[PDB]
Amino acid sequence: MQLTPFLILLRKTLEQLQEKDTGNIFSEPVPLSEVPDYLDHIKKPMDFFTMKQNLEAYRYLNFDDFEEDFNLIVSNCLKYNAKDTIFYRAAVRLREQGGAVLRQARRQAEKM
Ligand SMILES: O=C1CNc2cc(Br)ccc2N1
């Protein structure tokens, strides 16, 4: 496949995913000022802005690795936060809704 169409597809998929983050709690790195003990539990932080940066740095050359970092956004949040928190439920919703976005984008990818 050709790189340029693939990357415009990842750009579109990334904005579709970011759209699901209505609370805007995944679109920027978790502020270590608000959450000082965060990197004590979270080995690799991830967020949609970082993903965009990674995309443009050509770090995503297949959907698996793109999807890998999205999954980090979700799993980091499930790991750090108690089940009874808004944050945890947000991550579950993102897993669900983002999963559907990803399945479709992958389908368009398979077409390529
Ligand atoms: O796990 C998280 C996801 N994002 C976030 C943003 C702020 Br602001 C504060 C805490 C978190 N924790």
CA nearest ligand 1 atom 10, residue: 30
> Would you call 27 exposed, middle or buried from its count of C-beta atoms within 10 A (0-12, 13-18, 19+)?
middle
Q: Tell me how far apart the alpha carbons of residues 100 and 94 are, in angstroms, rounded to a whole number.
A: 10
90-94, Cβ contacts within 8 angstroms, sequence gap of 24 or more: 90/21, 90/23, 90/25, 90/26, 93/20, 94/17, 94/20, 94/21, 94/26
Among candidate residues 44, 47, 2, the one with its CA nearest the CA of residue 26 = 47
The number of CA neighbours under 13 Å toward the Cβ of 59 is 12
CA nearest ligand 1 atom 11, residue: 30
Q: Tell me how far apart the alpha carbons of residues 52 and 29 are, in angstroms, rounded to a whole number.
A: 12
Dist. CA 110 → ligand 1 center (Å): 34
DSSP letter (8 states) at residue 24 = -
88 pocket-lining for ligand 1 (C-beta < 6 Å): no
30 pocket-lining for ligand 1 (C-beta < 6 Å): yes
- Residue located via tokens 């990803």: 102
Maximum CA extent, the chain: 45
Determine contact, residues 106/60, Cβ cutoff 8 Å. Answer: no
Dist. CA 60 → ligand 1 center (Å): 25
Q: CB count, 10 Å around CB of 26?
A: 26
75 pocket-lining for ligand 1 (C-beta < 6 Å): no
81 pocket-lining for ligand 1 (C-beta < 6 Å): yes
79-91: burial string, b at 16+ Cβ within 10 Å, e else: ebbeeeeebbebb
34 pocket-lining for ligand 1 (C-beta < 6 Å): yes
Resolution of this deposited model, Å = 1.7
At the topology level, CATH places domain 1-112 in Histone Acetyltransferase; Chain A (1.20.920)
Determine contact, residues 9/108, Cβ cutoff 8 Å. Answer: yes
